[PDB]
Design a protein around this ligand. Structure first.
Ligand SMILES: CCCCCCCCCCCCCCCCCC(=O)OC[C@H](CO[C@@H]1O[C@H](CO[C@H]2O[C@H](CO)[C@H](O)[C@H](O)[C@H]2O)[C@H](O)[C@H](O)[C@H]1O)OC(=O)CCCCCCCCCCCCCCCCC
Ligand code: CLA
Ligand code: CLA
Ligand code: CLA
Ligand code: CLA
Ligand code: CLA
Ligand SMILES: CCCCCCCCCCCCCCCCCC(=O)OC[C@H](CO[C@@H]1O[C@H](CO)[C@H](O)[C@H](O)[C@H]1O)OC(=O)CCCCCCCCCCCCCCCCC
Ligand SMILES: CC1=C(/C=C/C(C)=C/C=C/C(C)=C/C=C/C=C(C)/C=C/C=C(C)/C=C/C2=C(C)CCCC2(C)C)C(C)(C)CCC1
Ligand SMILES: CC1=C(/C=C/C(C)=C/C=C/C(C)=C/C=C/C=C(C)/C=C/C=C(C)/C=C/C2=C(C)CCCC2(C)C)C(C)(C)CCC1
Ligand SMILES: CC1=C(/C=C/C(C)=C/C=C/C(C)=C/C=C/C=C(C)/C=C/C=C(C)/C=C/C2=C(C)CCCC2(C)C)C(C)(C)CCC1
Ligand SMILES: CC1=C(/C=C/C(C)=C/C=C/C(C)=C/C=C/C=C(C)/C=C/C=C(C)/C=C/C2=C(C)CCCC2(C)C)C(C)(C)CCC1
Ligand SMILES: CCCCCCCS[C@@H]1O[C@H](CO)[C@@H](O)[C@H](O)[C@H]1O
Ligand code: OEX
Ligand SMILES: [Ca+2]
Ligand SMILES: [Ca+2]
Ligand SMILES: [Cl-]
Ligand SMILES: [Cl-]
Ligand SMILES: [Mg+2]
Lengths: 341, 62, 29, 37, 455, 39, 81, 334, 30
């Protein structure tokens, strides 16, 4: 009784595809972000915004297609279809890069929708909402990289573009201009990701190699039952093994799994903080002591100064084509180059 | 002579496709094993013979 | 390139044809 | 190129090296036909 | 009538479909089928691929420009080639391909037969062809048969080299050519001297074999060793120390062979990467070292033509721009190719003297053909992209080229690695199965629970 | 007739998979001809 | 169970394949014609191979003005004869 | 029971706080040597002529480095793949100048780690466990072999092996991208899918198990006290966890079988990293990433750049600047 | 003093490894 309660009833039915209140936000925005990316990478160019071909229609492949960022001149325009730039013209809207903000924004609200889904389903099933909480890290990464970072810079142009090779270009750009690898926040990120992978692997392998024999099959998968009370593998034997091999071992299963949440989530959060720094060009670019010594002493060399030379190469050789709005013309004689090469 | 060669070779190719499909089927088929057997002997002999024939005829066009 | 696609189609159908044929006459699959 | 006589078989030749791959794939057709039992 | 009526399911065998071939461990007839059919697949690929290569082969173009790996193997044996490795006759390639392809029909026939028609087990049918994996005597006998077969094979290589046309010798006086080997190296100090060489730079273990006499002699030795060995294992049974040293099961034997083959794959990788004797650069393209050296040679030649005194030209770093010393004093090419001074090749060796590269020979004796070859090799360096765009990673599209040495080296490194993994997998599993806990820990008898606490 | 099972699932899988192979193969051919081929 | 009929019952059903042996080829052919007739170009504003440059021009038509970007693109397209 | 018997019993004993074992008889000394040499070199080694051009690079703390810039520097390009132990040098001073420490450390380390893998097998056998943890470990091990041994073999010099330091690692990565376009290589991509995916599934499994812990504690204590080491009962509700995950996606993307789930957890990153290792190990023989430089051309023949071509511009920057004094000839062929 | 600091922190970390392994709270089965 009461349309609201009826609606709530229908939304929260246990159908093959759970909808929920969250689905009202999630499904349209996720569908529009994905559909935007497929449409763009299949049919749409980046000629007027980047001087780039970027779709199957133009001859790109899966690795090289992208939905590219708007032109630098657009600033941080929302570039709405009915906005003052496209003025309701769909074709010009595509040519001006409108699909980029379309996908970034519908994608943002879609991520919100999904995390809301995690909360709603957790609440309906009766479990603690740790999955949502963990999803906060993908959120922090998306928001810092696709929104905050270009908002700090001159325009959406320097945001990552939505494509495989485009993203690779994003990586290389961050090396050359930001020296992003030197950033302790990126390093914490890397530790969280690789450490997460490590935990995934080692935990999986450990469970699979301390299994109790619970059937006669040589394929051990069948000897499990979801409603069984007993642990399917020996925590005691796993603990002894790792204590003798590595020196230390988990002994608390609950702590083990919380830690598996904690490592990659914390890592991604740290990387996000570094990127927020980079929005402002607030970089970990140099070590001043290194530079004072190297400047005064032409025989002093480390891997840090070598890498700066690489960065200088990257900036000089990639900037004219990567930043076409600057109209860079770098005569051959000013290009930094080592001997012969 | 060239079209003769092309014919014996084409014969070998045809017979080959026929063996490739028919031999496993015969081997794994319930009924008619004696018949299928005789025909696999036949196909095998004809196959060998055709390989030798193409082999010999080779040196009268190549 | 017509003969290539045709040949790989015949050859390509030969295997599933053996499986299908045996499955039909309830052979020792 | 193959000897001139054999040339009409060029397309067949172009396809033959791929057949062993087909056997791997055939293994999965067969298994599917017996329910992956 | 039932879908579980045969033994070909998990219910009967204990193995899931994705481990279905494990259902064959103790079915010797059907297993014989699997093996013979697979041999069929190998021989099939040899024949078919050779014919494909031959159909796509423009004989006056360099083999290595044409994505060929099998025709180089046949050509190395002396078939189809003349001086400099020119193709003089393609029909041998054709014969090799055809015969392998026809043979694969026979192997395939026997394989399919043994696999789905013949006796599923052999033991009741024949004591000779039947076997128990646990029977060390019978196993060593079969090992012996196969050792004898391998010995015969090595001797076939020897016979080709000595009595049936010889082999392609890239080092042949006056230029590479097919040469009959008449004085194979039988001296054991040399042969097994190779086996005791360091694998590191300027030594290269057996990969350093650099003349056909050593090769052929080595195969005489290996053939005899293998036939003798096979006789030994047919006439004997493993001793106590061996019995107590190993796990005795089909899976264990399999693991041992996987280890062996892994090792061999890595060895092959290095052989095709470094060796230009049994992988003639005429057919496979230059090695990486070789191409690098060849660049240094090319510009030494150009600049010396322009008037440079290349012996005395000091480069930017202080080291010679063209020529410098190795860490033990030999005169070697300059630039980064200083790493490749161990390289040896028939086009470069005439410039070599007792102390290394000879300045006088360089000034006076460099022939046109040497310039040609250095230029060719420098511009066919084994660098290229996965989609076969030739050259450095930053090169523009234009040349369709990846060196055969890259294809062969990479393929066999991948294969050797996964076969090392397979070795660990099946060795560990064999140990656990022989000991009786490959299916897991017995809840009622968990070993760690009867052990004292660590602390 | 919505009867579920009238067509053997292994045949459906085989045909479908072959279809995927065909289409992907067409795309890879496309990498060497026409737009995107570098020629 | 969720309440709906299993997919393996549908994709093996004759009805399903009756419907979809029509609808799938039709959609496929439709996308095909969306490209082969050239409509895609004009819907999304994607240059044809002969339309990235005027014949002797060699500078990218980069948009440089935010609010008359529409006009600037129209001008660039006009400059293609 | 003579001395050898007792010795074997102690070596293979399941009661040692740290298992020794036969692989351990090799592992322990080699790893001690690698570690000791590493710490001393990292603190105090003089600069090293890595590229064989008498241009020594300082790696150690006492010679002007911090933790981020420091490294044990790869041996000299003049050495190439030559074996350079201490006793091949005329003096320790020579040995240091030419990067001998690097060779000592990486060879002992690779031996030691191979034996570490072996050791995981060994103890699993002594404890009555299934044996494949060591196979999981073969993935990072194969990676170490790739950057320390195989790539130097392919390129002809340990001077191109990964340096033992943080910035040195970045140097290695950048030059690698210049010379192989590794980002456009499908095996490195599989590697990324492996470690991104591993991190994802790590967080996922962690959060789901955490989310369905059975209530065993009050609000003022850590939920972790709800689990006692060695307890027989599962500490969480796998049915609940599954019921959440199936609704989050659809019912069938979810694993209700814990064994299959944990197998997937092992297999995804292990296989991905296997491919990463094979990426480095095949780019070792210069079979490089996809090259789409100038792949799109217009009707006249003008190059229409794609993001691949921008990547190429960056790669060009790296290429022309790296080892600025080392090349005399126009092509970098190794 | 920077070097002394780096080496100090590292040394403390190794010490911590020692205690964490040999002076861990022993796992006990209930
Ligand atoms: C049971 C035993 C198990 C093993 C336990 C014992 C430890 C073994 C250690 C082996 C590793 C050695 C490292 C260096 C090997 C190397 O630099 O090998 C290179 C050598 C070749 O050496 C080269 O050999 C050349 C020979 O060519 C010469 O001669 C030629 C003649 O044609 C040419 O003329 C050429 O131009 C000329 O230079 C030169 O000497 C070069 O300078 C020299 O560098 O290959 C070879 O020796 C072949 C042998 C090595 C194969 C590669 C092994 C890689 C291991 C895989 C790791 C994966 C593990 C994963 C774990 C998870
Ligand atoms: C719920 C799902 C959802 C959400 C959150 C969004 C969100 C967005 N869309 Mg998307 N979109 C959706 C579904 C959704 N869309 C669907 C189904 C379609 C296909 C029809 C689209 C097709 C589409 C296109 C083509 C575009 C967008 C764009 C956008 C962005 C700008 C939208 C805007 O400015 O609205 C403004 C309007 C509102 C927010 C409506 C609010 C109405 C208020 C609340 C009523 C208030 C009544 C008041 C309280 C009564 C008081 C009474 C008093 C007066 C007496 C924004 C991120 C634009 C974009 O992405 O630019 C790059 C864009 O161009 N969308
Ligand atoms: C080199 C590849 C290879 C080979 C040689 C084999 C061989 C074998 N497998 Mg294995 N298998 C493989 C790969 C291979 N397998 C793969 C990739 C998988 C995973 C999909 C499996 C999963 C698997 C399972 C689950 C089982 C087997 C079994 C078997 C054995 C009996 C098969 C049978 O009776 O079916 C009957 C099949 C038919 C009747 C269909 C036709 C089969 C023939 C041989 C095809 C011939 C085609 C060829 C073109 C004909 C040429 C003819 C011409 C030369 C004259 C047989 C020895 C079974 C076993 O162990 O038996 C006890 C078993 O249960 N396999
Ligand atoms: C030793 C193995 C080997 C090697 C070194 C080569 C090398 C070559 N082949 Mg050949 N070939 C082979 C086996 C091999 N092939 C096999 C098995 C077949 C049957 C399919 C062929 C049929 C064939 C044809 C028809 C042609 C070639 C061609 C070529 C040349 C170009 C290769 C290329 O562009 O690939 C492109 C690169 C790839 C396709 C990458 C493959 C990546 C694989 C799938 C990774 C697998 C790793 C590992 C096995 C996976 C394990 C799984 C794990 C989970 C356990 C090159 C010289 C061409 C040529 O130039 O001929 C003149 C050509 O037209 N080959
Ligand atoms: C590859 C190893 C191999 C092994 C160990 C066997 C073993 C067996 N086969 Mg099988 N078979 C094989 C391959 C093999 N076969 C091949 C390749 C084919 C296709 C031609 C067959 C087709 C076949 C049929 C149709 C039958 C058998 C039968 C048998 C059983 C009796 C054979 C006998 O005693 O003949 C006696 C041996 C001789 C008369 C002398 C053999 C001389 C050979 C042919 C030439 C040797 C030259 C050289 C060594 C060959 C090298 C080949 C290599 C280069 C690839 C025995 C278990 C029988 C069976 O299972 O009955 C129940 C049976 O009916 N086989
Ligand atoms: C595929 C070929 C093969 C295989 C699988 C076997 C297998 C076997 N042989 Mg046989 N053997 C063979 C060929 C083979 N043999 C040949 C060709 C000959 C003639 C030379 C012999 C002569 C022979 C004799 C005299 C004996 C055996 C014995 C054995 C059994 C124990 C062997 C053992 O413990 O090895 C493991 C190896 C060791 C325990 C020694 C350690 C050697 C070091 C540690 C390895 C160094 C290798 C190095 C890293 C890499 C190579 C480079 C190096 C040379 C520098 C085992 C069944 C024994 C037996 O039981 O006979 C009944 C035995 O007494 N074999
Ligand atoms: C229920 C139904 C749900 C359906 C799925 C809907 C959402 C999923 C969409 C998946 C998109 C994946 C990329 C499409 C690639 C494509 O179309 O290539 C289309 C291209 C077309 O090929 C190109 O076309 C041009 C035409 O002018 C030129 O000819 C180029 O030279 C040529 O390369 O094909 C390729 O690039 C080669 C095949 C690559 C295929 C992708 C490999 C797998 C990568 C996906 C991994 C992440 C996504 C997983 C999703 C599952
Ligand atoms: C934008 C926009 C919109 C929307 C639209 C949409 C929504 C769309 C969708 C679209 C779509 C939805 C599409 C799809 C596509 C797909 C595809 C294109 C696919 C492909 C695939 C493939 C190619 C596959 C591959 C693979 C894989 C992945 C793995 C396995 C293997 C293989 C290879 C098979 C609107 C109107 C609102 C408005 C305007 C704007
Ligand atoms: C030499 C020669 C010959 C021979 C041939 C042959 C030997 C053939 C064979 C063939 C074959 C042998 C074929 C096969 C094929 C196969 C296939 C074609 C398959 C496919 C598959 C698939 C597609 C799958 C799918 C699936 C399933 C089923 C389930 C799971 C999922 C999936 C999807 C994976 C002849 C006679 C021509 C004559 C001339 C020469
Ligand atoms: C047991 C088993 C299996 C396997 C099987 C196999 C692996 C088989 C093999 C088979 C084989 C391995 C077969 C082969 C065949 C071959 C043939 C049939 C050939 C023929 C040839 C010809 C006909 C030739 C022709 C020619 C000439 C003479 C000249 C030049 C041109 C031409 C090329 C045309 C599977 C996996 C399915 C699963 C189930 C069970
Ligand atoms: C042909 C040739 C040649 C020759 C070669 C030769 C003469 C070889 C020999 C080789 C040999 C003569 C090898 C051997 C090997 C051996 C081995 C590889 C062994 C192994 C072992 C093992 C693996 C064991 C293990 C163990 C232990 C340690 C402990 C106890 C337990 C067991 C038993 C597990 C030359 C280079 C001149 C030239 C080229 C060609
Ligand atoms: C947005 C939330 C608005 C709730 S509004 C609420 O809804 C009920 C129906 O369920 C009515 O009966 C009630 O009178 C009305 O005030
Ligand atoms: O050393 Mn380290 O880095 Ca492999 O390229 Mn060449 O060399 Mn050097 O240059 Mn680029
Ligand atoms: Ca059964
Ligand atoms: Ca014996
Ligand atoms: Cl550098
Ligand atoms: Cl150089
Ligand atoms: Mg195309």
């Amino acid at each position: 009784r009461g349309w609201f309660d009826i609606l709530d009833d229908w939304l929260k039915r246990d159908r093959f595809v759970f909808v929920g209140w969250s689905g009202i936000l999630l499904f349209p925005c996720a569908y529009l972000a994905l559909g935007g990316w497929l449409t763009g990478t299949t049919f749409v160019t980046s000629w007027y915004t980047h001087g780039l071909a970027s779709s199957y229609l133009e001859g790109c492949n899966f690795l090289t297609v992208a939905v590219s960022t708007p032109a630098n001149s657009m600033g941080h325009s929302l570039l709405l279809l009915w906005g003052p730039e496209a003025q309701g013209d769909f074709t010009r809207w595509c040519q001006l890069g409108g699909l980029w903000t379309f996908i970034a924004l519908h994608g943002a609200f879609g991520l919100i929708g999904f995390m809301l889904r995690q909360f709603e389903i957790a609440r309906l099933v009766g479990v603690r909402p740790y999955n949502a909480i963990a999803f906060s890290a993908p959120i922090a990464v998306f928001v810092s990289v696709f929104l905050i970072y270009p908002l700090g810079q001159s325009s959406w142009f320097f945001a990552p573009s939505f494509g495989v090779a485009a993203i690779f270009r994003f990586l290389l750009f961050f090396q050359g201009f930001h020296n992003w690898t030197l950033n302790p926040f990126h390093m914490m990120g890397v530790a969280g990701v690789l450490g997460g992978a490590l935990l995934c692997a080692i935990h999986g392998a450990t469970v699979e190699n301390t299994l109790f024999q619970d059937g006669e099959g040589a394929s051990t998968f069948r000897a499990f039952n979801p409603t069984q009370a007993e642990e399917t593998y020996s925590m005691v034997t796993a603990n002894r093994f790792w204590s003798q091999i590595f020196g230390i071992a988990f002994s608390n299963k609950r702590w083990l799994h919380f830690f598996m949440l904690f490592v990659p989530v914390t890592g991604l959060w740290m990387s996000a903080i570094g990127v927020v720094g980079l929005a402002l060009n607030l970089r970990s670019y140099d070590f001043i002591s290194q530079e004072i010594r190297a400047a005064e002493d032409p025989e002093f060399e480390t891997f840090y100064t070598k890498n700066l030379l690489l960065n200088e190469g990257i900036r000089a050789w990639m900037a004219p084509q990567d930043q076409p709005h600057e109209n860079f013309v770098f005569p051959e004689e000013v290009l930094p180059r080592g001997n012969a090469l | 002579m060239t079209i003769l060669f092309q014919l014996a070779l084409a014969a070998l190719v045809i017979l080959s496709f026929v063996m490739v499909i028919g031999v496993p089927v015969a081997y794994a088929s319930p009924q008619d094993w004696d018949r299928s057997k005789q025909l696999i002997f036949l196909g095998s002999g004809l196959w060998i013979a055709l390989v030798l024939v193409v082999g010999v005829l080779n040196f009268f066009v190549v | 390139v017509i003969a290539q696609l045709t040949m790989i189609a015949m050859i390509g159908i030969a295997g599933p044809m053996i499986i299908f044929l045996l499955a039909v006459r309830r052979g020792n699959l | 190129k193959l000897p001139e006589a054999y040339a009409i078989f060029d397309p067949l030749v172009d396809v033959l090296p791929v057949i062993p791959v087909l056997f791997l794939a055939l293994a999965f057709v067969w298994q599917a036909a017996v329910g992956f039992r | 009538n039932s879908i579980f009526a045969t033994n070909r399911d998990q219910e009967s065998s204990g193995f899931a479909w994705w481990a279905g071939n494990a259902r064959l461990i103790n079915l010797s007839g059907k297993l014989l089928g699997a093996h013979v059919a697979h041999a069929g697949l190998i021989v099939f690929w040899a024949g078919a691929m050779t014919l494909f290569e031959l159909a796509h082969f423009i004989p006056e173009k360099p083999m290595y420009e044409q994505g060929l790996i099998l025709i180089p193997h046949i050509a190395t044996l002396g078939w189809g080639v003349g001086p400099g490795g020119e193709v003089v006759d393609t029909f041998p390639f054709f014969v090799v391909g055809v015969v392998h392809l026809i043979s694969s029909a026979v192997l395939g026939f026997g394989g399919v037969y043994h696999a789905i028609r013949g006796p599923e087990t052999l033991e009741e049918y024949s004591s000779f062809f039947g076997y128990d994996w646990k029977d060390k005597n019978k196993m060593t006998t079969i090992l012996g048969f196969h050792l004898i077969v391998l010995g015969i094979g090595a001797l076939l290589l020897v016979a080709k080299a000595m009595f049936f046309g010889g082999l392609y010798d890239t080092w042949a006086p006056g230029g590479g050519d097919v040469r009959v080997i008449t004085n194979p190296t039988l001296d054991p100090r040399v042969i097994f001297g190779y086996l005791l060489k360091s694998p590191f730079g300027g030594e290269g273990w057996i990969v350093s074999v650099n003349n056909l006499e050593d090769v052929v002699g080595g195969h005489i030795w290996i053939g005899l060793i293998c036939i003798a060995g096979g006789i030994w294992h047919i006439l004997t049974t493993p001793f106590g120390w061996a019995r107590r040293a190993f796990i005795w099961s089909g899976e264990a034997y399999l693991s041992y062979s996987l280890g062996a083959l892994s090792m061999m794959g890595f060895i092959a990788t290095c052989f095709v990467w470094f060796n230009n004797t049994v992988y003639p650069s005429e057919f496979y393209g230059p090695t990486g070292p070789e191409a690098s050296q060849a660049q240094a040679m090319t510009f030494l030649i150009r600049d010396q033509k322009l008037g440079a005194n290349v012996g005395s030209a000091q480069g930017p770093t202080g080291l010679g721009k063209y020529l410098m010393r190795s860490p033990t004093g030999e005169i070697i090419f300059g630039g980064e190719t200083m790493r490749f001074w161990d390289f040896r090749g028939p086009w470069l060796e005439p410039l070599r003297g007792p102390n290394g590269l000879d300045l006088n020979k360089i000034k006076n004796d460099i022939q046109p053909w040497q310039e040609r070859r250095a230029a060719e090799y420098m511009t066919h360096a084994p660098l290229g992209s996965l989609n076969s765009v030739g050259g450095v990673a930053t090169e523009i599209n234009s040349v369709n080229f990846v060196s055969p040495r890259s294809w062969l080296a990479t393929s066999h490194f991948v294969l050797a690695f996964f076969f090392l993994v397979g070795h660990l997998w099946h060795a560990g599993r064999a140990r656990a199965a022989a000991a009786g806990f490959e299916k897991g820990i017995d809840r009622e008898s968990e070993p760690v629970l009867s052990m004292p606490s660590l602390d | 007739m919505s009867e579920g099972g009238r067509i053997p699932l292994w045949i459906v899988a085989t045909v479908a998979g072959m279809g995927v192979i065909v289409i992907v193969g067409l795309f890879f051919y496309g990498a060497y001809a026409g737009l995107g081929s570098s020629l | 169970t969720t309440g709906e009929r299993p997919f393996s019952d549908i994709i093996t059903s004759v009805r399903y394949w009756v419907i979809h042996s029509i609808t799938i080829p039709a959609l496929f052919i439709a996308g095909w014609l969306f490209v082969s007739t050239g409509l895609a170009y004009d819907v999304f504003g994607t240059p044809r191979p002969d339309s990235y440059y005027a014949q002797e021009q060699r500078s990218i038509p980069l948009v440089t003005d935010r609010f008359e970007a529409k006009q600037q693109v129209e001008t660039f397209l006009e400059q293609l004869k | 029971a003579n001395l050898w018997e007792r010795f074997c019993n102690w070596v293979t004993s399941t009661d040692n706080r740290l298992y020794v074992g036969w692989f351990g008889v090799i592992m322990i000394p080699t790893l001690l040597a690698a570690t000791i040499c590493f710490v001393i070199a990292f603190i105090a080694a003089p600069p090293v002529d890595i590229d064989g051009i008498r241009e020594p690079v300082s790696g150690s703390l006492l010679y002007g480095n911090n933790i981020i810039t420091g490294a044990v520097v790869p041996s000299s390009n003049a050495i190439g793949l030559h074996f350079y132990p201490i006793w091949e040098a005329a003096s320790l001073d020579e040995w240091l100048y030419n990067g001998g420490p690097y060779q000592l450390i990486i060879f002992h380390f690779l031996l030691g780690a191979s034996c570490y893998m072996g050791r995981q097998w060994e103890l699993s056998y002594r404890l009555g466990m299934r044996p494949w943890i060591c196979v999981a470990y073969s993935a990072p091990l194969a990676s170490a072999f790739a950057v320390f041994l195989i790539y130097p073999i392919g390129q002809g010099s340990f001077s191109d092996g990964m340096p033992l330091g943080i910035s040195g690692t970045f140097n290695f990565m950048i030059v690698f991208q210049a010379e192989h376009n590794i980002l456009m290589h499908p095996f490195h991509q599989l590697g990324v899918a492996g470690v991104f995916g591993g991190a994802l599934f790590c967080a996922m499994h962690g959060s789901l198990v955490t989310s369905s812990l059975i209530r065993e504690t009050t609000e003022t204590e850590s939920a972790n006290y709800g689990y006692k080491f060695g307890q027989e009962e599962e500490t969480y509700n796998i049915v609940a966890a599954h019921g959440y995950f199936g609704r989050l996606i659809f019912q069938y993307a979810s694993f209700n079988n814990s064994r299959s789930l944990h197998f997937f957890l092992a297999a995804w990153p292990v296989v991905g990293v296997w491919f990463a290792a094979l990426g480095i190990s095949t780019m070792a023989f210069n079979l490089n990433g996809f090259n789409f430089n100038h792949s799109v051309i217009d009707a006249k023949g003008n190059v229409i750049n794609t993001w691949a071509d921008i990547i190429n511009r960056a790669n060009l920057g790296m290429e022309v600047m790296h080892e600025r004094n080392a090349h005399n000839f126009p092509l970098d062929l190794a | 003093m920077e070097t002394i600091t780096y080496v100090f922190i590292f040394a403390c970390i190794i010490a911590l490894f020692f205690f964490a392994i040999f002076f861990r709270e022993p796992p006990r089965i209930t």
